[PDB]
Ligand binder design. Structure first.
Ligand SMILES: CC(=O)N[C@H]1CN[C@H](CO)[C@@H](O)[C@@H]1O[C@@H]1O[C@H](CO)[C@H](O)[C@H](O)[C@H]1O
Length: 634
């Protein structure tokens, strides 16, 4: 017989190791590894040792490694042994490591993690977690120091019109952290409460408490959560109920998507929103969007903006001057609050009387303002937000192809439309993928999470390491799948109850039941009424992005869709996904039911819920309807 038996190496250091023992991969890669003699083994007795100040990091790492390795790993202070992982903050190593870099020394004193900041240590611990969670507990000795090439590395997450659940957001933040991604542009509505803004408290919105909680999580992971309220275009979710602030065309037709930048009250309204957001985000940036103001039309149709431009910025001024003037006035406004403005590149155009302020970060997504190379010449600060790194649920033109970009030598200097700039441009901040809902019934948020995996690893690698150590994309892919998700994602209880037959009293106004629950590949349920044989759907009501956003919309019974199929089945998407339900457990015990696409919660309507939508239509009192969680958490 073969005699095959586990090696079972003693814990700690060994001067003996095979010369080509695998070094488990990480993402980002840690390039320029120097090999040492021997190897180190996590095993019984291994501890995470640190100073008091690093105690929380050490405790979280010990707990996490205990779970991945099945070895009891505890945190400690004091002296470290060769059996141990040590965490060290050495702020004198800024030159070598910068603000986010780290050094690993693996050898006879154990596995040392050194960073120059708390986040550097944390980012080193992500590599330790990666290297140890792939079924190999012995690591080759040696040393490496790594630090990111670019300062801003991450994603646009448009949690916009539709709601991206806070649970999704928490998972996303965990994934970003694992990948050393430090930037998320979160276009989103914070629920407006003031007398002057509260009519825009339509769903999607996030509560102050909710935002505070995910910003605190983000910040502990080294992530800058930058809010965006897009202006002066794409303003439908803000202006629908404020027609007094909407821009009219020459014929008097208003667009709920356009702010009237000639109306000072409209401008004040936008600034009021800024001030509401200032209380809950911690970032030093404000992103005002500024994309697609005139989509589907032109400035020729808005003579009033030319008139305004001339009054405001002098004879000869054009609507493009008025537009840029509005951006510079918002720049002034946020600077006075201690923030730096960011915009999308596309409305930056041909001005006469006004020039765009150079202290505004330009996030470049569209070959449309200047070429990037033109903007470089003028000294603008640039982030690469190419459409090559977009996903959309509906627009199939936008699906990131990581294999292609990896193989074709894309780098962070490769601006939209294959427009290359010096990737060492000293005002090139980094790069990001972008995750856009657009027509939103085609894919659940859970399907988006499955789809974005590869691309998130791609961008992580190219913004930190700017290298291609895997010979092809396919070699990368094999290692990223081995590395897998971070612990929080593996722990998330997608489907907390077993498929089976249930009594659900909340649903009595639809049917006496019982209900047959089955699970879906994307972590939802379909609920079949055993009386009618039909399935529960959230199908009807006023929509944004083709998803029901109406507060107080009622579910209904419909012929049962096939919820077992994938997102490639685009023809049946809406009936399918309107039949998916997310079930969550309380802290502690009780279950809530949420339409998967909408992320509101089913509740029995009391008639005392307060929301602008309900001022004009309420579900009949005592019937089951969807509501944002804040209206039914009493
Ligand atoms: C900056 C940008 O990409 N602007 C738009 C054009 N491309 C993407 C992908 O199709 C669009 O999603 C972008 O518009 C954004 O749409 C969302 C809803 O999906 C919001 O309305 C944003 O305000 C808008 O910028």
């Amino acid at each position: 017989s073969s005699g095959l038996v586990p090696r079972g190496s003693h814990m700690g250091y060994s001067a003996t190791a095979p010369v080509n023992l695998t070094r488990p991969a990480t993402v980002p890669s840690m390039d320029g590894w120097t090999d040492g003699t021997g190897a180190w083994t996590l095993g019984e007795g291994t501890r995470v040792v640190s100073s008091d100040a690093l105690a929380a990091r050490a405790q979280s790492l010990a707990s996490e490694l205990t779970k991945f390795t099945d070895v009891d790993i505890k945190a400690a202070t004091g002296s470290a042994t060769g059996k141990d992982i040590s965490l060290t903050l050495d702020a004198s190593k800024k030159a070598e490591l910068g603000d986010e870099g780290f050094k690993l020394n693996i050898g006879s004193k154990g596995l040392e993690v050194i960073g120059a900041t708390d986040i550097g240590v944390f980012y080193g611990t992500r590599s330790v977690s990666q290297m140890l969670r792939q079924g190999q507990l012995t690591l080759p000795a040696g040393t490496v120091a790594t630090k990111p090439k670019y300062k801003e590395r991450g994603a646009t997450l448009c949690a916009c019109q539709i709601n991206i659940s806070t649970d999704w957001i928490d998972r996303f933040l965990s994934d970003m952290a694992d990948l050393r991604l430090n930037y998320v542009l979160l276009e989103m509505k914070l629920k407006p409460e003031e007398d002057n803004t509260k009519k825009a408290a339509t769903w999607s919105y996030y509560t102050r408490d909710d935002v505070k909680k995910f910003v605190k999580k983000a910040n502990n992971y080294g992530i800058d959560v930058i809010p965006e309220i897009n202006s002066p275009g794409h303003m439908n979710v803000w202006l629908e109920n404020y027609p007094e602030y909407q821009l009219a065309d020459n014929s008097g037709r208003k667009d709920p998507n356009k702010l009237d930048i000639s109306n000072p009250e409209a401008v004040k309204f936008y600034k009021t929103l800024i001030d509401e957001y200032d209380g809950v985000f911690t970032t030093k940036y404000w992103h005002m969007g500024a994309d697609e103001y005139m989509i589907g039309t032109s400035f020729d149709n808005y003579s009033k903006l030319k008139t305004f431009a001339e009054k405001q910025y002098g004879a000869g001024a054009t609507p493009n001057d008025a537009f840029t003037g509005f951006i510079n006035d918002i720049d002034k406004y946020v600077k006075a609050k201690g923030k730096q403005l960011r915009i999308w590149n596309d409305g930056i155009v041909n001005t006469k009387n006004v020039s765009l302020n150079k202290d505004i970060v330009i996030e470049y997504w569209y070959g449309a303002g200047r070429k990037p190379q033109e903007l470089v010449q003028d000294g603008y600060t640039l982030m690469n937000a190419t459409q090559a790194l977009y996903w959309s649920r509906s627009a199939q033109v936008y699906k990131v192809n990581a294999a292609r970009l990896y193989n074709n030598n894309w780098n962070v200097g490769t601006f939209d439309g294959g427009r290359q700039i010096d990737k060492n441009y000293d005002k090139l901040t980094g790069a990001k993928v972008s995750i856009w809902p657009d027509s939103s019934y085609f894919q659940t948020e859970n399907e988006v999470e499955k789809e974005i995996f590869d691309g998130m690893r791609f961008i992580s690698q190219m913004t930190w390491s700017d290298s291609r150590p895997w010979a092809t994309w396919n070699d990368m892919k094999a290692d990223i799948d081995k590395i897998g998700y971070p612990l929080d994602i593996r722990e998330y209880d997608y489907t907390p109850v077993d498929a089976g037959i249930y009594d659900i009293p909340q649903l009595k106004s639809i049917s006496k039941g019982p209900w047959e629950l089955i699970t879906t590949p994307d972590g939802y349920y379909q609920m079949k009424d055993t009386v009618s044989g039909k399935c529960l759907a959230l199908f009807t009501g006023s929509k944004h992005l083709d998803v029901v956003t109406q507060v107080g919309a009622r579910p209904e019974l419909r012929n049962c869709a096939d919820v077992s199929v994938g997102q490639d089945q685009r023809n049946t998407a809406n009936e399918r996904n309107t039949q998916k339900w997310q079930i969550r457990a309380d802290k502690d015990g009780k279950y809530t039911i949420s339409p998967a696409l909408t992320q509101q919660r089913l509740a029995i309507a009391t008639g005392n819920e307060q929301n602008i939508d309900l001022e004009t239509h309420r579900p009949a009192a005592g019937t089951v309807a969807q509501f944002p969680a804040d209206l039914v958490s009493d």
